[PDB]
Symmetry: C3
Subunit: 113 residues, 3 copies
């Protein structure tokens, strides 16, 4: 499969959305639809799926939620996984410093009941 | 392929958007790009593609628009398809009760 | 793989977003995530990936950024590539004719 560039993913302070390459998406749409489809489209290209999941982990998302791709990633290159873990800890620290600061529905209700 | 969770899809009253796992998308973008890519990414994993298409059907969308995947799905387990049909009829009733009750700034951006 | 319909893609005047089947997306999200995933999902079905990349090219986007799919496409049917090129030039002429973004900071800090 062809690889993705390093995934530009930021998780929102309330965790409800992500910012992916300048596009804001609901977190659950990204993790349940987008990432699953990216991984499935890699087929058996474990190097590519490992890259994707390292970026998922680095962004603070759950890289273990993707079946065989997750099991491959979890028993994959320890040093690249560790670089992802360093990035993840930096992300969590950013979330902590962001947690140091002090009507969508109605709209959706009118459109979807 | 790895499976999707049960697809959380709601069709808007005017049918122009869908709400998928909390994300609003144009219906045409979802059905022409997103669903097509999900199904293609299953390869020949018919259990997964039948799951996807049962959720598409249950949401009130057209599960017949996806070539070989739709042909497989149409011949698939009748009871699982019927459970999807029950959900589809409930969604249609919800649309009926809702039918009982801009800006197109796109021009400036896209011409 | 199953085919896509002709891709309805318009590039914004500032090039920062695209309008794809009525959905506005950041251009980089569309080209880095969506298109890459569509192409990967075709596997080795070059007829389908060539159709995708002709529509990408026709919209004013870079059809050369997708590895093997781009390499296959660049040597594919010259007349179909040229029809895409005509659409691309018409799109560029369209771009030529003329007359609190964060906001994300409060949400993402960056
Ligand atoms: Mg998408």
């Amino acid at each position: 499969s062809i690889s993705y560039r390093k995934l530009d993913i930021a998780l929102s302070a309330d965790k409800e959305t992500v910012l992916v390459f300048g596009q804001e998406l609901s977190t659950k749409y990204f993790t349940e639809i987008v990432v699953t489809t990216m991984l499935n489209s890699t087929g058996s290209d474990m190097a590519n799926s490992n890259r994707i999941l390292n970026d998922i982990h680095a962004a603070g998302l759950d890289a273990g939620d993707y079946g065989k791709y997750s099991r491959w990633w979890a028993q994959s290159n320890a040093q690249e996984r560790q670089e992802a873990e360093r990035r993840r800890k930096e992300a969590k620290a950013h979330q902590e410093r962001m947690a140091a600061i002090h009507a969508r529905e109605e709209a959706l209700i009118k459109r979807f009941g």
